[PDB]
Design a protein around this ligand. Structure first.
Ligand SMILES: C=C(C)[C@@H]1CCC(C)=C[C@H]1c1c(O)cc(O)cc1CCCCC
Length: 140
């Protein structure tokens, strides 16, 4: 049984600016956003999952039930909202973000001490890897 609970620090973030360009994020904000190295704080509580992407620039909080479609407010990212469903696919977590953009979603999984996150839109792929960490810090 896969359990994503933990605190995770960004190690790599590959091709994020092109992913943001495919979302039509303005160039100045793409530059700002790709300098950020947010942590992830995840609590998996039965089928209720909370994924907190944490940085001093901004926190983005996902709070959902696996298998239940919900309205995801991404307006601070790319001025859009999606109808999002997160589901198990073997040992991976699959997210489909239905909306104006084609093929928008992500896939998350664990390898050893690494949290792997692949995000996609319009055929453009960004890959992030985080390392599991144990020193915790307070966030709001
Ligand atoms: C909430 C944030 C820290 C920022 C907010 C601004 C943008 C354009 C992207 C987010 C971002 C970022 O700059 C780096 C990331 O690794 C992840 C995310 C969250 C949104 C991901 C989907 C675009």
């Amino acid at each position: 049984p896969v359990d994503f609970t933990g605190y995770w620090k960004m190690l790599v973030n590959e091709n994020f600016e092109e992913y943001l360009r495919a979302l039509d994020v303005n160039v100045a904000l793409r530059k700002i956003a790709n300098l950020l190295k947010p942590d992830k704080e995840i609590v998996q509580d039965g089928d209720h999952m909370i994924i907190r992407t944490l940085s001093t620039f901004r926190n983005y909080i996902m709070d959902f039930q696996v298998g239940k479609e919900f309205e995801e407010d991404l307006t601070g990212i790319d001025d859009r909202k999606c109808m999002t469903t997160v589901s198990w696919d073997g040992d991976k977590l699959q997210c489909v973000q239905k909306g104006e953009k084609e093929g928008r979603g992500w896939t998350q999984w664990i390898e050893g001490d690494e949290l792997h996150l692949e995000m996609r839109v319009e055929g453009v792929v960004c890959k992030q890897v985080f390392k599991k960490v144990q020193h915790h810090h307070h966030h709001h």
